[PDB]
Motif scaffolding. Structure first.
Motif, PDB file in Angstrom:
ATOM      1  N   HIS A   1       0.979  -1.206   0.078  1.00  0.00           N
ATOM      2  CA  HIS A   1       0.054   0.071   0.094  1.00  0.00           C
ATOM      3  C   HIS A   1       0.895   1.135  -0.062  1.00  0.00           C
ATOM      4  O   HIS A   1       0.680   2.319  -0.557  1.00  0.00           O
ATOM      5  N   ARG A   2       1.887   1.189   0.906  1.00  0.00           N
ATOM      6  CA  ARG A   2       2.863   2.416   0.985  1.00  0.00           C
ATOM      7  C   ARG A   2       3.557   2.739  -0.337  1.00  0.00           C
ATOM      8  O   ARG A   2       3.663   3.941  -0.713  1.00  0.00           O
ATOM      9  N   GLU A   3       3.846   1.776  -1.205  1.00  0.00           N
ATOM     10  CA  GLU A   3       4.350   2.325  -2.384  1.00  0.00           C
ATOM     11  C   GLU A   3       3.303   2.844  -3.145  1.00  0.00           C
ATOM     12  O   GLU A   3       3.661   3.875  -3.751  1.00  0.00           O
ATOM     13  N   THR A   4       2.004   2.463  -3.208  1.00  0.00           N
ATOM     14  CA  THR A   4       1.048   3.104  -3.803  1.00  0.00           C
ATOM     15  C   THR A   4       0.689   4.450  -3.375  1.00  0.00           C
ATOM     16  O   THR A   4       0.280   5.454  -4.098  1.00  0.00           O
ATOM     17  N   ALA A   5       0.813   4.487  -1.973  1.00  0.00           N
ATOM     18  CA  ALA A   5       0.721   5.727  -1.392  1.00  0.00           C
ATOM     19  C   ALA A   5       1.590   6.814  -1.863  1.00  0.00           C
ATOM     20  O   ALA A   5       1.420   7.912  -2.001  1.00  0.00           O
ATOM     21  N   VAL A   6       3.076   6.312  -1.994  1.00  0.00           N
ATOM     22  CA  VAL A   6       4.095   7.121  -2.187  1.00  0.00           C
ATOM     23  C   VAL A   6       3.739   7.721  -3.914  1.00  0.00           C
ATOM     24  O   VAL A   6       4.193   8.931  -4.229  1.00  0.00           O
ATOM     25  N   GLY A   7       3.092   6.758  -4.595  1.00  0.00           N
ATOM     26  CA  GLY A   7       2.536   7.184  -5.970  1.00  0.00           C
ATOM     27  C   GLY A   7       1.770   8.586  -5.878  1.00  0.00           C
ATOM     28  O   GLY A   7       1.767   9.369  -6.506  1.00  0.00           O
TER      29      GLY A   7
ATOM     30  N   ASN B   1      11.744  10.355 -13.962  1.00  0.00           N
ATOM     31  CA  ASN B   1      11.857   9.001 -14.284  1.00  0.00           C
ATOM     32  C   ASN B   1      13.284   9.028 -14.791  1.00  0.00           C
ATOM     33  O   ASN B   1      13.941   7.961 -14.373  1.00  0.00           O
ATOM     34  N   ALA B   2      13.738   9.410 -15.646  1.00  0.00           N
ATOM     35  CA  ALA B   2      15.141   9.370 -16.147  1.00  0.00           C
ATOM     36  C   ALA B   2      16.229   9.624 -15.005  1.00  0.00           C
ATOM     37  O   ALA B   2      17.339   9.160 -15.120  1.00  0.00           O
ATOM     38  N   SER B   3      15.790  10.627 -14.290  1.00  0.00           N
ATOM     39  CA  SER B   3      16.700  10.927 -13.164  1.00  0.00           C
ATOM     40  C   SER B   3      16.693   9.484 -12.174  1.00  0.00           C
ATOM     41  O   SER B   3      17.796   9.449 -11.466  1.00  0.00           O
ATOM     42  N   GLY B   4      15.758   8.636 -12.215  1.00  0.00           N
ATOM     43  CA  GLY B   4      15.755   7.321 -11.550  1.00  0.00           C
ATOM     44  C   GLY B   4      15.875   7.572  -9.971  1.00  0.00           C
ATOM     45  O   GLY B   4      16.320   6.740  -9.347  1.00  0.00           O
ATOM     46  N   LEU B   5      15.486   8.577  -9.552  1.00  0.00           N
ATOM     47  CA  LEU B   5      15.303   9.027  -7.917  1.00  0.00           C
ATOM     48  C   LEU B   5      14.403   7.915  -7.369  1.00  0.00           C
ATOM     49  O   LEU B   5      14.361   7.510  -6.152  1.00  0.00           O
TER      50      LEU B   5
ATOM     51  N   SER C   1      12.801   4.394  -7.124  1.00  0.00           N
ATOM     52  CA  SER C   1      13.114   2.576  -7.175  1.00  0.00           C
ATOM     53  C   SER C   1      11.851   2.291  -8.228  1.00  0.00           C
ATOM     54  O   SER C   1      10.870   2.579  -8.107  1.00  0.00           O
ATOM     55  N   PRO C   2      12.041   0.888  -8.818  1.00  0.00           N
ATOM     56  CA  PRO C   2      10.932   0.408  -9.353  1.00  0.00           C
ATOM     57  C   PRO C   2       9.720   0.016  -8.703  1.00  0.00           C
ATOM     58  O   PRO C   2       8.776   0.094  -9.496  1.00  0.00           O
ATOM     59  N   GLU C   3      10.131  -0.299  -7.291  1.00  0.00           N
ATOM     60  CA  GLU C   3       8.820  -0.506  -6.592  1.00  0.00           C
ATOM     61  C   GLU C   3       7.951   0.620  -6.582  1.00  0.00           C
ATOM     62  O   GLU C   3       6.696   0.684  -6.748  1.00  0.00           O
ATOM     63  N   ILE C   4       8.462   1.712  -6.356  1.00  0.00           N
ATOM     64  CA  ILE C   4       7.822   2.994  -6.286  1.00  0.00           C
ATOM     65  C   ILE C   4       7.356   3.355  -7.536  1.00  0.00           C
ATOM     66  O   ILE C   4       6.161   3.900  -7.638  1.00  0.00           O
ATOM     67  N   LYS C   5       8.022   3.333  -8.622  1.00  0.00           N
ATOM     68  CA  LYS C   5       7.471   3.360 -10.168  1.00  0.00           C
ATOM     69  C   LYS C   5       6.364   2.831 -10.459  1.00  0.00           C
ATOM     70  O   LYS C   5       5.452   3.127 -10.863  1.00  0.00           O
TER      71      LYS C   5
END
Ligand SMILES: CCCCCCCCO[C@@H]1O[C@H](CO)[C@@H](O)[C@H](O)[C@H]1O
Ligand SMILES: CCCCCCCCO[C@@H]1O[C@H](CO)[C@@H](O)[C@H](O)[C@H]1O
Ligand code: NA
Ligand code: NA
Lengths: 417, 409
Positions: free
Chosen positions: B228-234, B275-279, B281-285
């Motif tokens: 949920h947290r990753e989604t929340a970071v979204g 995105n290009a900065s890659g700040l 992580s794939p999980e967050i993306k």
């Protein structure tokens, strides 16, 4: 440092956000809407949330993440840190857009519809009445000490008993403020600021007496069953439906309170109270499949765990007066609070004995786990006395019992006023 | 019994009834909070029934738009026909504009659609696939302007009400945000624009799937971890990236020239940069994607109830179903075909394949279309490419639009 996360955001990423916050701040460019509001509230809540979560003493006994946020946030309004714009954005989310209600609506729905149909209906007969017995004892002892301390019966019931027995900060204190303001007319922040403070005191006493009843249980074994209360014998869509039901159940509650059944008597039934009854009814009706019932839970998780910190930034801004908080940490309240807890202990002990449960176990689950800070507290209480296996019971108190407390409160408030 | 197994918005008929009863109680009694809660309560339920209805209808579903179209039309007819209460109109409008759920919605979409795309795929895609898309747009514009000048319609209108909206990524993602940019830059009502733009776009969507089968004949003739947290970071990033875009447009860089850069356009650039900065992580993306799904699939129907109320005029929609438009639209699609065919040939791709992915999958109705287009020509295996057009290309169209609009005005 990079491996350190803030709100599940690595320090590098959080910086990006914190930079943006500051750009909005410096340049004083911010939309006073949902988007602008959440943007701020998320970030601010995130940093101070973690800070209050990491602090040792503070975390376990004061409240932690949420407390740190709603205090800091209020200090920002006090100290004039926030911009008029930022205050507007946050308030616009909380009151105009009314995210507060949605939040509570989601909570109520998910907390009540999560509980299994049988468990609910069964629990009513024995465990529920025990809870009510605890409340009676909590009230009777509270009133007794208040009358001794020259505080009227109103105040004891509204600012001490109800808030303590209520399910914590987000679930008890915050909605009780709303019901208080809807029924008396007096500011929410007056009430919350006092209520949150007493409640926290009681939470600390609850975990202390939990260890005291453990010693008494092990000293006098005829009162405690060894950790046993009784004397004898999905996808996005489901979660989305949770949201539908959350709002829909609030709307029904609202239409009922405003038009259909404004008042059972002189007494005015607040829409939140109705909601609890409606949702509970909806559970017993079993119109909701278990998948959907879980959907509602999954929402309330998402709200309680992700959006709670946002909420607190708003609670410090609209519902929080730092001065009244300080003024309610009187040495006198510390005693009043403690005794109300004891009233709950003896109330639930007697009640459970009458219902067939062990008095010690009953006083812990239907008593201390009521007076504690909602869910977070259950864990901290059941650890002081080694009864962690009753967590399922404790949550029935914190959830269903907390819902009860709102219905009771709506009645207590009105008839008292 | 079988009906009861019948679900509306994943709600069994019995349960939906409970909600539909509540709606009617609020309606009869005229008791409704004009806020988020009251708004969503209505919008959810109304959108649910008409959403399913538009989804079940055969002809309508595949070629007109389906669920969302049915809702935004029905909803507008409710305002027109006076079905809705002032209160209900207020609630819904309060959610869309005062509370500004519309922006959040778009913000979430942008973020999730751009940060989902893999860092390498994005950077790589820029060099070859992206320029092809731009070539398609040029061809779509040049042909559009050509037919418009033939039809006595000015260059403004062709670019703003036909080309841009067609190439944009559909209803929620193109038409709806382009209305917002249009109103922010010209001053004219959104409903004026959306009502025409949605109409042309749908026509082109039908031509896109037809030419897809025509190019097929011509071609044959010649981490998984989530929390949920990753989604929340979204959600955090969605709002945060909008705020940065906003602060940039209003204070830091209001205008690159005389031209005013709209905050949504900036957002696309910001998110893409992020995105290009890659700040992230794939999980967050993925978290951002998971959000955009939840919005696009659950909250879209709510949104449409609001789109029919604020952004929809039923009269202008009818007036844009011009047989003249049917021709203009079709030709603009052909302009995209030839534009992407030439462009891809220059970039090293097969012209037929390029015209389908970077051309027709642009002119189609965003994501929904890609499936209907790539089925007419059997190229379903390029769905990953098609979505790059619908997502990144749709994002491009907004940036382009913000510039086109301003300089034209
Ligand atoms: C060192 C432990 C401190 C315990 C304090 C209570 C001391 C004993 O307490 C007494 O014990 C009797 C049993 O023999 C009971 O019948 C009495 O009710 C009880 O008060
Ligand atoms: C305005 C409020 C928006 C709330 C939307 C929350 C929807 C989150 O939905 C959750 O997303 C997770 C991430 O994939 C999944 O793991 C969960 O199973 C899913 O229910
Ligand atoms: Na409590
Ligand atoms: Na399109």
């Amino acid at each position: 440092l990079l491996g350190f996360k803030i709100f599940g955001m690595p320090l590098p990423l959080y910086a990006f956000a914190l930079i943006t916050l500051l750009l909005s701040h410096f340049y004083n460019a911010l939309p006073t809407d949902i988007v602008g509001g959440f943007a701020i509230m998320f970030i601010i809540g995130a940093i101070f949330g973690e800070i209050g979560k990491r602090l040792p003493i503070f975390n376990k006994y004061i409240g932690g993440a949420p407390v740190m946020i709603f205090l800091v946030a209020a200090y920002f309004v006090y100290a004039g840190i926030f911009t008029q714009k930022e205050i507007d954005a946050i308030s616009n989310v909380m009151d105009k857009s009314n995210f507060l209600n949605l939040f509570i609506a989601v909570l109520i729905t998910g907390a009540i519809l999560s509980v299994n149909r049988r468990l609910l209906l069964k629990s009513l007969l024995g465990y529920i009445p025990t809870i009510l017995m605890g409340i009676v004892g909590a009230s009777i002892f509270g009133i007794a000490i208040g009358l001794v301390f020259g505080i009227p019966v109103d105040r004891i019931m509204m600012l001490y008993v109800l808030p303590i027995m209520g399910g914590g900060n987000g679930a008890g204190a915050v909605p009780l403020s709303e019901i208080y303001h809807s029924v008396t007319g007096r500011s929410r922040e007056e009430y919350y600021s006092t209520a949150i403070a007493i409640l926290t005191i009681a939470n600390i006493f609850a975990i202390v007496f939990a260890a005291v009843l453990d010693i008494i249980g092990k000293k006098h074994t005829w009162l405690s069953g060894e950790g046993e209360l009784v004397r004898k014998a999905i996808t996005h869509r489901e979660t989305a439906v949770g949201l539908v039901l959350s709002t829909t159940c609030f709307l029904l509650a609202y239409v009922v309170a405003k038009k259909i059944l404004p008042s059972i008597g002189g007494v005015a039934i607040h829409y939140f109270a109705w909601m609890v009854l409606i949702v509970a009814a909806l559970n017993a009706s079993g119109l909701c499949s278990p998948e959907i019932k879980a959907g509602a839970k999954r929402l309330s998780d998402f709200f309680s765990k992700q959006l709670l910190w946002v909420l607190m930034v708003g609670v410090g801004v609209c519902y929080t007066d730092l001065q009244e908080i300080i003024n309610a940490i009187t040495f006198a309240n510390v005693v009043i609070a403690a005794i109300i807890v004891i009233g709950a202990v003896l109330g639930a002990a007697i009640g459970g004995w009458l219902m067939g449960f062990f008095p010690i176990e009953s006083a812990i689950t239907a008593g201390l786990c009521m007076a504690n800070r909602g869910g977070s507290g259950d864990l901290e209480v059941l650890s002081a006395c080694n009864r962690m296996n009753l967590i399922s019971y404790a949550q029935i108190s914190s959830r269903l019992g907390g819902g009860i407390v709102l219905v009771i409160a709506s009645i207590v408030f009105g008839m008292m006023i």
